[PDB]
Amino acid sequence: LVHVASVEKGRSYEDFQKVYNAIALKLREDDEYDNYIGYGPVLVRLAWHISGTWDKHDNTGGSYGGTYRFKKEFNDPSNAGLQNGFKFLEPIHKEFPWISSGDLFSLGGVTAVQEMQGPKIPWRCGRVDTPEDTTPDNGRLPDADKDAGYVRTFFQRLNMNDREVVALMGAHALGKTHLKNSGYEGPGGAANNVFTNEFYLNLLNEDWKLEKNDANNEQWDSKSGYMMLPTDYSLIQDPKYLSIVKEYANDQDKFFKDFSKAFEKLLENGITFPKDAPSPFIFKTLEEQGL
Template identity: 75%
Template sequence: MSTANRFVPLASRAVFSRRVMLGLVGSAGVLGVAADLHQRRDGYRGGNGNGNGRSTGKLWTPLVAGAPIAHLAQVDKKYGESDYQAVYNAIAEKLRDEDEYDNYIGYGPVLLRLSWHCSGTWDKKDNTGGSFGGTYRFQKESNDPSNNGLENAAHFLEPIKKQFPWISYGDLYTLGGVTAVQELQGPKIAWRPGRVDMPEDTTPDNGRLPDADNGASYVRNFFDRMNFNDREVVALMGGHALGKTHLANSGYEGPWGAATNTFTNEFYNNLLNEHWTLEKNEANNEQYNSPKGYMMLKTDMALVQDDKYLPIVKEFAKDQNAFFKEYTNAFQKLLQNGITYSKDSPVFVFKTLDEQDL
């Protein structure tokens, strides 16, 4: 595979894929603008343990004749905030218990990356992909070269699924990312349930995740597919404060900074202040290296090479609160892209384990 086709995930402390995710994206409840290709409505409520959904026999129909079809969130009212907080707690406690993963970086970054990759396949043109259907559980998506290493996050979450079989995979994967951000000292992320495990034929085609070997024009066009503006793009890329790349899995090697398991604005400060040299690594791929042993991808450096991105990078480097505020909204948007929520659909903001210990 050529270097142009290698995806490298963004905020993953775990093993990375051939392509790097440019950042973590988000917004709440963006509607799709085209008919769902499979024309199903509330069928396929939840999957069984093998990830195979069961049809209720109802078909997807337009909300209004001739209008786009949207994925409608389905919230089981038997389960409330305390039930989802219990799922959050189980994930967070497992993060603490299994902290030796990846040389004590831990599972947080790879959980964040899983939630990004599950959501980052969304396309506003036809409302396909995204987090709604939990389709990462199928081999077509999980075996995408862009998802190399994410099996570690999926295996980490599988015991949680067995403990709470009522939660959909789409909800579990996205809640895992929210838990990782919050437990690694990042901002609070408002999260909404209601994703439905869809059948295998709704899995998006491979190739929708970003390519690390490109500049600012590519980055801007890529995120436009998911309705993100420049400010949101720069915020989402800040997730690269977490984790590191691994040569064997992504074709790139090294961390973006020193605090690989603490969510901060370090990524922006490193972009601005480190001395970067473009070099070829052992896989013959070009990456930017600093004397401290940090690395940046070409898509990362695009943020300081572009006149519109650069002022935002400088703002977030100076003001972590501004970064956290923008990231909160953008990441929530990413996780909810393409999903339609009713007016009474719940929104949860979970307490961290530390907050519950007070």
């Protein structure tokens, strides 16, 4: 299966910077959401989940087709709560109807990361909506109650190695688990709408206890009020993951650079970019624009 990026007709960097800006301004305006966490984290999770259906073996799933807009994928149990991010983006799409759904969902994630003071994430346009019958079945996103070997094997399907996996998981510094969405409850650090390397510092420095939550699932809890999923905690149980966790806990810039690469790759998996395509766009933040 081949998906060739096709630039939305006549559009260039400035058009996409305008969509960025709309998203970024709404992120600012709608600050109350989720006990004043705001929509940044859920937009990052949305961009990951629309990308994380990809299968390298046959190029099914992936961000290209924008298939999250269809009921089967929208109602994936793994996607519970992301309707909030979709609803956030609806007025943006209404204002910019020319952008594809896949470009919008992925640009949402990029915008959120940058506006939360994360790394710059280069982003490429040209995802094209595909029909309802291209929507991947439920069950391609990962379970949270598993161990390091599960995580490693899972991410091979997405063509991600150990470093890419550990880098990507640093996003779990953002937002929180919600018991009603996933059967897990709690945040991963104190600054959960600012993008930092706190996930790794918390993994290493907190005193974690294995407890049951009110949904009868096990999770790791600290007296600080933080939590880790079993899959999060597996990153310090496996000796190879642990080395990389320590590396990112001790080098903010290295984490930023490695996250940026892995996140762009995640968002671009499955897509063929013509040699004549535009170079990746690097959007200015509102702050950089004086906006």
